[PDB]
Amino acid sequence: SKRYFVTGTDTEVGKTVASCALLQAAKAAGYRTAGYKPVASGSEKTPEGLRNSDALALQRNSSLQLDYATVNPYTFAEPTSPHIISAQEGRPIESLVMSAGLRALEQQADWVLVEGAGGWFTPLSDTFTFADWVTQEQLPVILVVGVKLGCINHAMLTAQVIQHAGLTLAGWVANDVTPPGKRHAEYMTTLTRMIPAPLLGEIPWLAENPENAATGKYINLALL
Amino acid sequence: SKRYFVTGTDTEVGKTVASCALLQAAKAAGYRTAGYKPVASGSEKTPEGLRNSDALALQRNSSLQLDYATVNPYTFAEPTSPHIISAQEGRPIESLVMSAGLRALEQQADWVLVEGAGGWFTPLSDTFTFADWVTQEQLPVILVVGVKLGCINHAMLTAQVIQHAGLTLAGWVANDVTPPGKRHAEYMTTLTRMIPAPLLGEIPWLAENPENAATGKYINLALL
Ligand SMILES: Nc1ncnc2c1ncn2[C@@H]1O[C@H](COP(=O)(O)OP(=O)(O)CP(=O)(O)O)[C@@H](O)[C@H]1O
Ligand SMILES: Nc1ncnc2c1ncn2[C@@H]1O[C@H](COP(=O)(O)OP(=O)(O)CP(=O)(O)O)[C@@H](O)[C@H]1O
Ligand SMILES: C[C@H](N)[C@H](N)CCCCCC(=O)O
Ligand SMILES: C[C@H](N)[C@H](N)CCCCCC(=O)O
Ligand SMILES: [Mn+2]
Ligand SMILES: [Mn+2]
Protein backbone atom coordinates (compact mmCIF):
# COMPACT_ATOMS: atom_id res chain seq x y z
CA SER A 1 0.00 0.00 0.00
CA LYS A 2 1.21 3.58 -0.39
CA ARG A 3 1.33 5.08 3.13
CA TYR A 4 1.73 8.78 4.18
CA PHE A 5 1.77 10.58 7.53
CA VAL A 6 0.21 14.05 7.61
CA THR A 7 1.63 16.58 10.08
CA GLY A 8 1.08 20.31 10.52
CA THR A 9 3.11 23.43 11.35
CA ASP A 10 0.91 23.77 14.46
CA THR A 11 -2.35 22.37 15.98
CA GLU A 12 -5.36 23.95 14.18
CA VAL A 13 -3.76 24.71 10.75
CA GLY A 14 -6.28 22.60 8.72
CA LYS A 15 -4.59 19.18 8.87
CA THR A 16 -7.96 17.34 8.73
CA VAL A 17 -9.15 19.59 5.87
CA ALA A 18 -6.05 18.82 3.83
CA SER A 19 -6.28 15.04 4.72
CA CYS A 20 -9.88 14.95 3.35
CA ALA A 21 -8.70 16.73 0.16
CA LEU A 22 -5.86 14.17 -0.20
CA LEU A 23 -8.25 11.27 0.41
CA GLN A 24 -10.70 12.65 -2.20
CA ALA A 25 -7.93 13.01 -4.83
CA ALA A 26 -6.68 9.43 -4.14
CA LYS A 27 -10.19 7.98 -4.52
CA ALA A 28 -10.52 9.91 -7.78
CA ALA A 29 -7.29 8.32 -9.00
CA GLY A 30 -8.81 4.90 -8.37
CA TYR A 31 -7.17 3.89 -5.05
CA ARG A 32 -8.99 1.94 -2.33
CA THR A 33 -8.38 4.53 0.45
CA ALA A 34 -8.39 4.50 4.26
CA GLY A 35 -7.78 7.31 6.71
CA TYR A 36 -6.12 6.43 10.05
CA LYS A 37 -6.08 8.70 13.13
CA PRO A 38 -4.38 6.46 15.75
CA VAL A 39 -4.61 8.90 18.64
CA ALA A 40 -7.30 11.54 19.20
CA SER A 41 -8.05 13.92 22.13
CA GLY A 42 -11.12 16.20 22.15
CA SER A 43 -14.11 13.84 21.74
CA GLU A 44 -17.95 13.86 22.07
CA LYS A 45 -20.03 11.39 24.09
CA THR A 46 -22.49 9.26 21.97
CA PRO A 47 -24.47 6.00 22.72
CA GLU A 48 -21.56 4.12 21.24
CA GLY A 49 -18.77 5.78 23.29
CA LEU A 50 -16.52 8.70 22.49
CA ARG A 51 -16.18 9.91 18.92
CA ASN A 52 -13.70 12.47 17.66
CA SER A 53 -14.71 14.80 14.78
CA ASP A 54 -11.41 14.45 12.84
CA ALA A 55 -11.62 10.65 12.93
CA LEU A 56 -15.29 10.90 11.73
CA ALA A 57 -14.17 13.05 8.83
CA LEU A 58 -11.41 10.55 7.90
CA GLN A 59 -13.87 7.65 8.19
CA ARG A 60 -16.44 9.32 5.89
CA ASN A 61 -13.83 10.35 3.29
CA SER A 62 -12.31 6.81 2.90
CA SER A 63 -13.56 4.78 -0.09
CA LEU A 64 -13.87 1.62 2.08
CA GLN A 65 -16.69 1.40 4.70
CA LEU A 66 -14.62 1.13 7.93
CA ASP A 67 -15.70 0.88 11.59
CA TYR A 68 -14.89 3.77 13.85
CA ALA A 69 -12.48 1.87 16.11
CA THR A 70 -10.47 0.73 13.06
CA VAL A 71 -9.95 4.41 12.14
CA ASN A 72 -9.28 5.63 15.67
CA PRO A 73 -8.19 3.09 18.27
CA TYR A 74 -7.35 5.67 21.06
CA THR A 75 -10.08 8.21 21.82
CA PHE A 76 -9.84 10.71 24.70
CA ALA A 77 -12.49 13.21 25.72
CA GLU A 78 -10.29 16.14 26.82
CA PRO A 79 -8.67 18.32 24.13
CA THR A 80 -5.14 18.35 25.63
CA SER A 81 -1.84 16.60 24.90
CA PRO A 82 -2.39 12.78 24.52
CA HIS A 83 0.25 11.98 27.13
CA ILE A 84 -1.45 14.03 29.91
CA ILE A 85 -4.91 12.54 29.46
CA SER A 86 -3.51 9.00 28.89
CA ALA A 87 -1.72 9.07 32.29
CA GLN A 88 -4.84 10.65 33.84
CA GLU A 89 -7.01 7.81 32.62
CA GLY A 90 -4.67 4.93 33.20
CA ARG A 91 -4.78 3.97 29.48
CA PRO A 92 -1.22 3.70 28.03
CA ILE A 93 -0.84 4.54 24.35
CA GLU A 94 0.95 1.49 23.00
CA SER A 95 3.18 1.54 19.92
CA LEU A 96 2.28 -2.07 19.10
CA VAL A 97 -1.47 -1.23 19.08
CA MET A 98 -0.82 1.85 16.80
CA SER A 99 1.27 -0.32 14.40
CA ALA A 100 -1.17 -3.30 14.43
CA GLY A 101 -3.95 -0.89 13.49
CA LEU A 102 -1.97 0.36 10.48
CA ARG A 103 -1.41 -3.25 9.33
CA ALA A 104 -5.13 -4.03 9.67
CA LEU A 105 -5.95 -1.13 7.32
CA GLU A 106 -3.31 -2.37 4.88
CA GLN A 107 -5.16 -5.69 4.53
CA GLN A 108 -7.93 -3.85 2.78
CA ALA A 109 -6.67 -0.51 1.47
CA ASP A 110 -3.95 0.27 -0.96
CA TRP A 111 -3.59 4.00 -0.17
CA VAL A 112 -3.53 4.81 3.51
CA LEU A 113 -3.27 8.31 5.05
CA VAL A 114 -2.22 8.53 8.72
CA GLU A 115 -3.03 11.81 10.55
CA GLY A 116 -1.05 12.58 13.69
CA ALA A 117 -2.15 14.62 16.65
CA GLY A 118 -0.97 18.28 17.03
CA GLY A 119 2.44 18.99 15.44
CA TRP A 120 5.55 16.82 15.02
CA PHE A 121 6.74 16.41 18.56
CA THR A 122 3.43 15.63 20.37
CA PRO A 123 4.27 13.43 23.43
CA LEU A 124 2.42 10.10 23.72
CA SER A 125 4.03 9.07 27.00
CA ASP A 126 6.84 10.49 29.14
CA THR A 127 9.53 8.68 27.08
CA PHE A 128 7.81 8.39 23.66
CA THR A 129 6.63 10.99 21.06
CA PHE A 130 4.61 10.70 17.88
CA ALA A 131 7.84 11.48 15.98
CA ASP A 132 9.37 8.30 17.45
CA TRP A 133 6.56 6.08 16.06
CA VAL A 134 6.65 7.72 12.56
CA THR A 135 10.45 7.21 12.44
CA GLN A 136 9.96 3.64 13.60
CA GLU A 137 7.42 3.05 10.80
CA GLN A 138 9.53 4.86 8.17
CA LEU A 139 6.47 6.73 6.93
CA PRO A 140 6.99 9.51 4.32
CA VAL A 141 5.62 12.78 5.68
CA ILE A 142 3.32 15.41 4.07
CA LEU A 143 3.53 18.80 5.79
CA VAL A 144 0.39 20.96 6.02
CA VAL A 145 1.19 24.69 6.31
CA GLY A 146 -1.56 27.13 7.41
CA VAL A 147 -0.61 30.35 5.55
CA LYS A 148 -0.38 33.04 8.27
CA LEU A 149 2.35 35.27 9.77
CA GLY A 150 4.85 32.99 11.59
CA CYS A 151 4.35 30.03 9.21
CA ILE A 152 7.77 30.39 7.35
CA ASN A 153 9.61 29.79 10.62
CA HIS A 154 7.33 26.89 11.64
CA ALA A 155 7.54 25.23 8.19
CA MET A 156 11.34 25.39 8.16
CA LEU A 157 11.76 24.10 11.71
CA THR A 158 9.49 21.08 11.01
CA ALA A 159 11.14 20.37 7.57
CA GLN A 160 14.64 20.29 9.07
CA VAL A 161 13.80 18.05 12.03
CA ILE A 162 12.06 15.47 9.74
CA GLN A 163 15.02 15.41 7.36
CA HIS A 164 17.51 15.13 10.24
CA ALA A 165 15.54 12.03 11.36
CA GLY A 166 16.32 10.46 7.98
CA LEU A 167 12.68 10.55 6.83
CA THR A 168 11.34 11.58 3.40
CA LEU A 169 9.37 14.78 3.30
CA ALA A 170 7.02 13.83 0.47
CA GLY A 171 5.48 17.25 -0.19
CA TRP A 172 3.62 20.08 1.45
CA VAL A 173 0.07 21.48 1.22
CA ALA A 174 -0.72 25.25 1.61
CA ASN A 175 -3.95 25.78 3.53
CA ASP A 176 -5.55 29.24 3.50
CA VAL A 177 -6.80 29.60 7.01
CA THR A 178 -7.75 33.34 6.55
CA PRO A 179 -9.36 35.42 3.74
CA PRO A 180 -6.97 36.92 1.06
CA GLY A 181 -4.45 39.20 2.86
CA LYS A 182 -1.86 41.68 1.53
CA ARG A 183 1.32 39.49 1.32
CA HIS A 184 -0.21 36.17 0.13
CA ALA A 185 1.80 35.83 -3.05
CA GLU A 186 5.20 36.68 -1.45
CA TYR A 187 4.49 34.26 1.40
CA MET A 188 3.70 31.48 -1.15
CA THR A 189 6.94 32.24 -3.15
CA THR A 190 9.14 32.16 0.04
CA LEU A 191 7.54 28.89 1.27
CA THR A 192 7.98 27.28 -2.18
CA ARG A 193 11.62 28.33 -2.27
CA MET A 194 12.37 27.16 1.29
CA ILE A 195 10.56 23.81 1.81
CA PRO A 196 12.67 21.11 0.13
CA ALA A 197 9.62 19.09 -1.13
CA PRO A 198 7.02 19.70 -3.93
CA LEU A 199 3.99 21.91 -3.31
CA LEU A 200 1.05 19.46 -3.78
CA GLY A 201 -1.59 22.28 -4.00
CA GLU A 202 -3.32 25.17 -2.22
CA ILE A 203 -6.73 24.86 -0.50
CA PRO A 204 -8.56 28.26 -0.60
CA TRP A 205 -10.28 29.83 2.42
CA LEU A 206 -13.71 28.18 2.65
CA ALA A 207 -15.92 29.81 5.23
CA GLU A 208 -18.63 27.13 5.78
CA ASN A 209 -17.62 23.59 6.75
CA PRO A 210 -14.45 22.98 4.57
CA GLU A 211 -13.99 19.29 5.63
CA ASN A 212 -17.29 18.46 3.89
CA ALA A 213 -16.37 20.58 0.82
CA ALA A 214 -15.21 18.88 -2.38
CA THR A 215 -11.55 19.88 -2.25
CA GLY A 216 -9.81 16.98 -4.02
CA LYS A 217 -9.41 19.21 -7.15
CA TYR A 218 -6.88 21.43 -5.33
CA ILE A 219 -4.41 18.49 -4.93
CA ASN A 220 -2.05 17.24 -7.68
CA LEU A 221 -1.47 13.60 -6.61
CA ALA A 222 0.92 13.29 -9.54
CA LEU A 223 3.67 14.88 -7.45
CA LEU A 224 3.49 12.28 -4.71
CA SER B 1 30.16 42.03 27.78
CA LYS B 2 27.73 39.18 28.40
CA ARG B 3 25.55 38.90 25.25
CA TYR B 4 22.28 36.92 24.74
CA PHE B 5 19.87 36.52 21.84
CA VAL B 6 16.18 36.17 22.73
CA THR B 7 13.97 34.12 20.40
CA GLY B 8 10.42 32.82 20.73
CA THR B 9 8.42 29.69 19.89
CA ASP B 10 6.32 31.90 17.58
CA THR B 11 5.68 35.62 16.79
CA GLU B 12 3.48 37.14 19.55
CA VAL B 13 4.46 34.85 22.50
CA GLY B 14 5.69 37.72 24.77
CA LYS B 15 9.33 37.98 23.63
CA THR B 16 9.46 41.75 24.37
CA VAL B 17 7.77 41.20 27.77
CA ALA B 18 10.35 38.60 28.75
CA SER B 19 13.24 40.79 27.37
CA CYS B 20 12.11 43.70 29.62
CA ALA B 21 11.95 41.31 32.62
CA LEU B 22 15.49 40.07 31.79
CA LEU B 23 16.77 43.64 31.39
CA GLN B 24 15.19 44.65 34.75
CA ALA B 25 16.82 41.68 36.56
CA ALA B 26 20.25 42.47 35.00
CA LYS B 27 20.04 46.13 36.08
CA ALA B 28 19.12 44.95 39.57
CA ALA B 29 22.23 42.76 39.61
CA GLY B 30 24.32 45.85 38.87
CA TYR B 31 25.03 45.46 35.12
CA ARG B 32 25.17 48.42 32.71
CA THR B 33 22.47 47.06 30.32
CA ALA B 34 21.47 47.69 26.70
CA GLY B 35 18.67 46.18 24.65
CA TYR B 36 19.26 45.73 20.90
CA LYS B 37 16.51 45.07 18.31
CA PRO B 38 18.48 45.12 15.01
CA VAL B 39 15.51 44.59 12.72
CA ALA B 40 11.91 45.68 13.33
CA SER B 41 8.76 45.63 11.12
CA GLY B 42 5.46 47.14 12.29
CA SER B 43 6.27 50.80 13.10
CA GLU B 44 4.47 54.13 13.82
CA LYS B 45 5.13 57.44 12.06
CA THR B 46 6.44 60.26 14.40
CA PRO B 47 8.15 63.67 13.69
CA GLU B 48 11.44 61.86 14.02
CA GLY B 49 10.70 58.98 11.59
CA LEU B 50 9.41 55.51 12.21
CA ARG B 51 9.47 54.05 15.71
CA ASN B 52 8.71 50.47 16.65
CA SER B 53 7.05 49.73 20.03
CA ASP B 54 9.32 46.77 20.94
CA ALA B 55 12.45 48.83 20.30
CA LEU B 56 10.94 51.66 22.46
CA ALA B 57 10.37 49.18 25.26
CA LEU B 58 13.98 47.90 25.01
CA GLN B 59 15.30 51.47 24.93
CA ARG B 60 13.36 52.49 28.06
CA ASN B 61 14.32 49.33 30.00
CA SER B 62 18.12 49.70 29.40
CA SER B 63 20.11 51.29 32.26
CA LEU B 64 22.10 53.45 29.78
CA GLN B 65 20.35 56.39 28.00
CA LEU B 66 20.63 55.27 24.34
CA ASP B 67 19.39 56.90 21.11
CA TYR B 68 16.67 55.14 19.20
CA ALA B 69 18.75 54.37 16.11
CA THR B 70 21.43 52.73 18.29
CA VAL B 71 18.75 50.33 19.61
CA ASN B 72 17.06 49.71 16.27
CA PRO B 73 19.01 50.45 13.10
CA TYR B 74 16.43 48.91 10.63
CA THR B 75 12.85 50.12 11.05
CA PHE B 76 10.04 49.15 8.64
CA ALA B 77 6.46 50.35 8.79
CA GLU B 78 4.62 47.21 7.62
CA PRO B 79 4.18 44.32 10.09
CA THR B 80 5.31 41.51 7.73
CA SER B 81 8.46 39.43 7.26
CA PRO B 82 11.59 41.71 7.15
CA HIS B 83 12.75 40.26 3.84
CA ILE B 84 9.50 41.16 1.98
CA ILE B 85 9.37 44.79 3.10
CA SER B 86 13.17 45.23 2.70
CA ALA B 87 12.99 44.20 -1.00
CA GLN B 88 9.85 46.35 -1.39
CA GLU B 89 11.65 49.40 -0.10
CA GLY B 90 14.99 48.90 -1.74
CA ARG B 91 16.77 48.88 1.68
CA PRO B 92 18.95 45.73 2.06
CA ILE B 93 19.38 44.40 5.58
CA GLU B 94 23.15 44.15 5.90
CA SER B 95 24.91 41.72 8.24
CA LEU B 96 27.83 44.14 8.69
CA VAL B 97 25.46 46.93 9.85
CA MET B 98 23.73 44.50 12.33
CA SER B 99 27.14 43.39 13.71
CA ALA B 100 28.61 46.95 13.85
CA GLY B 101 25.57 48.00 15.88
CA LEU B 102 26.18 45.22 18.41
CA ARG B 103 29.83 46.32 18.77
CA ALA B 104 28.77 49.95 19.32
CA LEU B 105 26.55 48.85 22.24
CA GLU B 106 29.42 46.81 23.65
CA GLN B 107 31.56 49.97 23.95
CA GLN B 108 29.22 51.16 26.64
CA ALA B 109 27.27 48.24 28.09
CA ASP B 110 28.45 45.13 29.80
CA TRP B 111 25.20 43.12 29.54
CA VAL B 112 23.55 43.26 26.15
CA LEU B 113 20.25 41.57 25.18
CA VAL B 114 19.54 41.14 21.45
CA GLU B 115 15.88 40.52 20.45
CA GLY B 116 15.26 38.94 17.06
CA ALA B 117 12.23 39.35 14.86
CA GLY B 118 9.52 36.62 14.77
CA GLY B 119 10.83 33.09 15.48
CA TRP B 120 14.18 31.42 14.70
CA PHE B 121 14.10 31.17 10.95
CA THR B 122 12.83 34.68 9.99
CA PRO B 123 14.26 35.52 6.51
CA LEU B 124 16.22 38.78 6.20
CA SER B 125 16.94 38.43 2.48
CA ASP B 126 16.39 35.66 -0.07
CA THR B 127 19.67 33.93 0.87
CA PHE B 128 20.08 34.99 4.55
CA THR B 129 18.03 34.31 7.74
CA PHE B 130 18.24 35.69 11.26
CA ALA B 131 19.50 32.24 12.32
CA ASP B 132 22.51 32.71 10.01
CA TRP B 133 23.54 35.99 11.73
CA VAL B 134 23.12 34.55 15.29
CA THR B 135 25.26 31.52 14.31
CA GLN B 136 27.79 33.88 12.76
CA GLU B 137 27.93 35.90 16.01
CA GLN B 138 28.01 32.78 18.24
CA LEU B 139 25.39 34.29 20.53
CA PRO B 140 23.94 32.07 23.31
CA VAL B 141 20.16 31.86 22.91
CA ILE B 142 17.33 32.28 25.48
CA LEU B 143 14.06 30.71 24.33
CA VAL B 144 10.76 32.38 25.29
CA VAL B 145 7.84 29.91 25.40
CA GLY B 146 4.24 31.25 25.48
CA VAL B 147 2.40 28.56 27.50
CA LYS B 148 -0.53 27.47 25.28
CA LEU B 149 -1.63 24.28 23.48
CA GLY B 150 0.93 23.55 20.72
CA CYS B 151 3.88 25.05 22.65
CA ILE B 152 5.58 21.64 23.56
CA ASN B 153 6.03 20.88 19.86
CA HIS B 154 7.24 24.42 19.04
CA ALA B 155 9.68 24.51 22.00
CA MET B 156 11.22 21.16 21.03
CA LEU B 157 11.56 22.00 17.34
CA THR B 158 13.34 25.32 18.13
CA ALA B 159 15.59 23.70 20.85
CA GLN B 160 16.80 20.98 18.47
CA VAL B 161 17.56 23.27 15.53
CA ILE B 162 19.61 25.66 17.76
CA GLN B 163 21.61 22.78 19.22
CA HIS B 164 22.17 21.24 15.77
CA ALA B 165 23.65 24.63 14.74
CA GLY B 166 26.25 24.19 17.50
CA LEU B 167 24.88 27.09 19.57
CA THR B 168 24.33 27.18 23.36
CA LEU B 169 20.74 27.28 24.49
CA ALA B 170 21.28 29.31 27.65
CA GLY B 171 17.85 28.85 29.24
CA TRP B 172 14.16 29.32 28.63
CA VAL B 173 11.46 31.63 30.02
CA ALA B 174 7.78 30.53 30.46
CA ASN B 175 5.39 33.33 29.59
CA ASP B 176 1.73 33.01 30.59
CA VAL B 177 -0.07 34.46 27.65
CA THR B 178 -3.57 33.37 28.93
CA PRO B 179 -5.31 33.28 32.37
CA PRO B 180 -4.83 30.07 34.52
CA GLY B 181 -6.15 27.08 32.49
CA LYS B 182 -6.79 23.43 33.46
CA ARG B 183 -3.45 21.74 32.46
CA HIS B 184 -0.96 24.49 33.47
CA ALA B 185 1.07 22.43 35.90
CA GLU B 186 1.41 19.36 33.60
CA TYR B 187 2.41 21.61 30.70
CA MET B 188 5.13 23.24 32.90
CA THR B 189 6.44 19.77 34.05
CA THR B 190 6.62 18.44 30.41
CA LEU B 191 8.39 21.61 29.15
CA THR B 192 10.89 21.47 32.06
CA ARG B 193 11.62 17.82 31.33
CA MET B 194 12.00 18.33 27.57
CA ILE B 195 13.93 21.60 27.02
CA PRO B 196 17.62 20.84 27.62
CA ALA B 197 18.34 24.25 29.32
CA PRO B 198 17.42 25.73 32.77
CA LEU B 199 14.03 27.35 33.34
CA LEU B 200 14.97 30.99 34.19
CA GLY B 201 11.44 31.83 35.55
CA GLU B 202 7.73 32.19 34.78
CA ILE B 203 6.03 35.53 34.01
CA PRO B 204 2.34 35.42 35.14
CA TRP B 205 -0.58 36.60 32.98
CA LEU B 206 -0.74 40.38 33.42
CA ALA B 207 -3.80 41.88 31.82
CA GLU B 208 -2.84 45.61 31.60
CA ASN B 209 0.38 46.64 29.84
CA PRO B 210 2.89 43.87 30.96
CA GLU B 211 5.96 45.46 29.25
CA ASN B 212 5.69 48.42 31.65
CA ALA B 213 5.09 46.10 34.66
CA ALA B 214 7.93 45.43 37.11
CA THR B 215 8.64 41.82 36.17
CA GLY B 216 12.37 41.47 36.93
CA LYS B 217 11.47 39.54 40.15
CA TYR B 218 10.20 36.57 38.10
CA ILE B 219 13.70 35.96 36.59
CA ASN B 220 16.55 34.11 38.37
CA LEU B 221 19.63 35.57 36.62
CA ALA B 222 21.73 33.21 38.71
CA LEU B 223 21.03 30.40 36.25
CA LEU B 224 22.44 32.27 33.27
N1 LIG C 1 -9.40 26.08 4.12
C2 LIG C 1 -9.96 26.52 5.24
N3 LIG C 1 -10.89 27.49 5.20
C4 LIG C 1 -11.58 27.86 6.28
N5 LIG C 1 -11.38 27.27 7.43
C6 LIG C 1 -10.46 26.31 7.57
C7 LIG C 1 -9.71 25.91 6.48
N8 LIG C 1 -8.88 24.97 6.90
C9 LIG C 1 -9.08 24.76 8.21
N10 LIG C 1 -10.06 25.58 8.60
C11 LIG C 1 -10.73 25.56 9.93
O12 LIG C 1 -9.69 25.64 10.93
C13 LIG C 1 -10.01 24.73 12.00
C14 LIG C 1 -8.95 23.64 12.03
O15 LIG C 1 -9.13 22.78 10.90
P16 LIG C 1 -8.63 21.25 10.96
O17 LIG C 1 -9.47 20.47 11.90
O18 LIG C 1 -8.60 20.64 9.61
O19 LIG C 1 -7.14 21.41 11.54
P20 LIG C 1 -6.17 20.49 12.39
O21 LIG C 1 -6.34 19.11 11.90
O22 LIG C 1 -4.75 20.98 12.31
C23 LIG C 1 -6.69 20.48 14.15
P24 LIG C 1 -5.99 19.31 15.38
O25 LIG C 1 -4.66 19.80 15.88
O26 LIG C 1 -6.97 19.11 16.48
O27 LIG C 1 -5.76 17.98 14.51
C28 LIG C 1 -11.40 24.17 11.71
O29 LIG C 1 -12.42 24.93 12.37
C30 LIG C 1 -11.49 24.25 10.19
O31 LIG C 1 -12.81 24.15 9.64
N1 LIG D 1 2.57 37.96 30.53
C2 LIG D 1 1.65 38.40 29.69
N3 LIG D 1 0.41 38.71 30.14
C4 LIG D 1 -0.49 39.29 29.35
N5 LIG D 1 -0.20 39.60 28.11
C6 LIG D 1 0.99 39.30 27.57
C7 LIG D 1 1.95 38.68 28.35
N8 LIG D 1 3.01 38.50 27.58
C9 LIG D 1 2.75 38.98 26.36
N10 LIG D 1 1.51 39.48 26.37
C11 LIG D 1 0.87 40.27 25.28
O12 LIG D 1 1.00 39.50 24.07
C13 LIG D 1 1.35 40.39 22.99
C14 LIG D 1 2.74 40.03 22.50
O15 LIG D 1 3.71 40.42 23.50
P16 LIG D 1 5.22 40.75 23.06
O17 LIG D 1 5.27 42.01 22.27
O18 LIG D 1 6.12 40.81 24.24
O19 LIG D 1 5.58 39.48 22.13
P20 LIG D 1 6.57 39.24 20.92
O21 LIG D 1 7.81 39.99 21.21
O22 LIG D 1 6.80 37.78 20.70
C23 LIG D 1 5.88 39.98 19.39
P24 LIG D 1 6.86 40.14 17.84
O25 LIG D 1 6.89 38.85 17.09
O26 LIG D 1 6.30 41.26 17.03
O27 LIG D 1 8.34 40.46 18.40
C28 LIG D 1 1.30 41.81 23.56
O29 LIG D 1 0.02 42.41 23.32
C30 LIG D 1 1.59 41.60 25.03
O31 LIG D 1 1.24 42.71 25.89
C1 LIG E 1 5.46 41.57 12.12
C2 LIG E 1 5.73 40.64 13.29
N3 LIG E 1 5.07 41.19 14.47
C4 LIG E 1 7.25 40.44 13.51
N5 LIG E 1 7.95 41.71 13.48
C6 LIG E 1 7.88 39.61 12.36
C7 LIG E 1 7.34 38.22 12.09
C8 LIG E 1 8.04 37.62 10.86
C9 LIG E 1 7.48 36.23 10.61
C10 LIG E 1 8.06 35.51 9.39
C11 LIG E 1 7.47 34.10 9.31
O12 LIG E 1 8.03 33.19 9.92
O13 LIG E 1 6.41 33.91 8.71
C1 LIG F 1 -6.30 18.90 21.42
C2 LIG F 1 -5.70 19.31 20.09
N3 LIG F 1 -6.77 19.79 19.23
C4 LIG F 1 -4.91 18.14 19.44
N5 LIG F 1 -5.68 16.92 19.49
C6 LIG F 1 -3.61 17.83 20.23
C7 LIG F 1 -2.58 18.93 20.41
C8 LIG F 1 -1.44 18.43 21.29
C9 LIG F 1 -0.43 19.55 21.46
C10 LIG F 1 0.77 19.21 22.36
C11 LIG F 1 1.74 20.39 22.36
O12 LIG F 1 2.61 20.45 21.49
O13 LIG F 1 1.60 21.30 23.18
MN1 LIG G 1 -7.07 17.29 12.93
MN1 LIG H 1 8.78 41.67 20.14
Name the residue ranges covered by the structural domains of chain A.
1-224
Contact flag B84-A126 (C-beta cutoff 8 Å): no
Alpha-carbon distance A195 to A9, whole Å? 12
What is the full DSSP assignment across chain A?
A: -EEEEEEESSTTSSHHHHHHHHHHHHHHTT--EEEE--EEES-B--TTS-B-HHHHHHHHHSSS---HHHH-SEEESS-S-HHHHHHHHT----HHHHHHHHHHHHTT-SEEEEE-SSSTT-BSSSS-BHHHHHHHHT--EEEEEE-STTHHHHHHHHHHHHHHTT--EEEEEEE--SS--TTHHHHHHHHHHHSSS-EEEEEPP-SS-TTTS--GGG--GGG-
Q: What is the resolution of this structure in A?
A: 1.6
User: Buried b vs exposed e over A89-124: b needs ≥16 C-beta within 10 Å?
Assistant: eeeebebeebeebbeebeeebebbbbbbbbbbbbbb
Phi and psi at residue B4, in whole multiples of 5°?
-145, 140
By what method was this entry solved? X-ray
Closest by CA position to B40, among listed B145, B132, B116, B153 = B116
Chain B environment of A183 (Cβ under 8 Å): 80-81, 84
> Which residues on adjacent β-strands are paired with residue A203?
A175
Do the beta carbons of residue B174 and residue B145 sit within 8 Å? yes
Chain B environment of A83 (Cβ under 8 Å): 190
For the four alpha carbons of A23, A28, A31 and A33, in that order, the dihedral sign comes to positive
Residue nearest to atom 2 of ligand 4 (CA): A79
Q: Which residues of B are catalytic?
A: 37
Contact flag B193-A149 (C-beta cutoff 8 Å): no
Q: Which residues of A are catalytic?
A: 37
The gap from C-alpha B61 to its chain's centroid, in whole angstroms, comes to: 13
Alpha-carbon distance A38 to A48, whole Å? 18
> Which residues on adjacent β-strands are paired with residue A113?
A4, A35
Ligand 3: distance of its center to the CA of A207 in Å? Answer: 25
Alpha-carbon distance A73 to A40, whole Å? 9
With CA atoms as reference, the chain B residue closest to A182 would be B80
Q: Hey, what CATH topology would domain B1-224 get?
A: Rossmann fold (3.40.50)
SS3 track for chain B: CEEEEEEECCCCCCHHHHHHHHHHHHHHCCCCEEEECCEEECCECCCCCCECHHHHHHHHHCCCCCCHHHHCCEEECCCCCHHHHHHHHCCCCCHHHHHHHHHHHHCCCCEEEEECCCCCCCECCCCCEHHHHHHHHCCCEEEEEECCCCHHHHHHHHHHHHHHCCCCEEEEEEECCCCCCCCHHHHHHHHHHHCCCCEEEEECCCCCCCCCCCCHHHCCHHHC
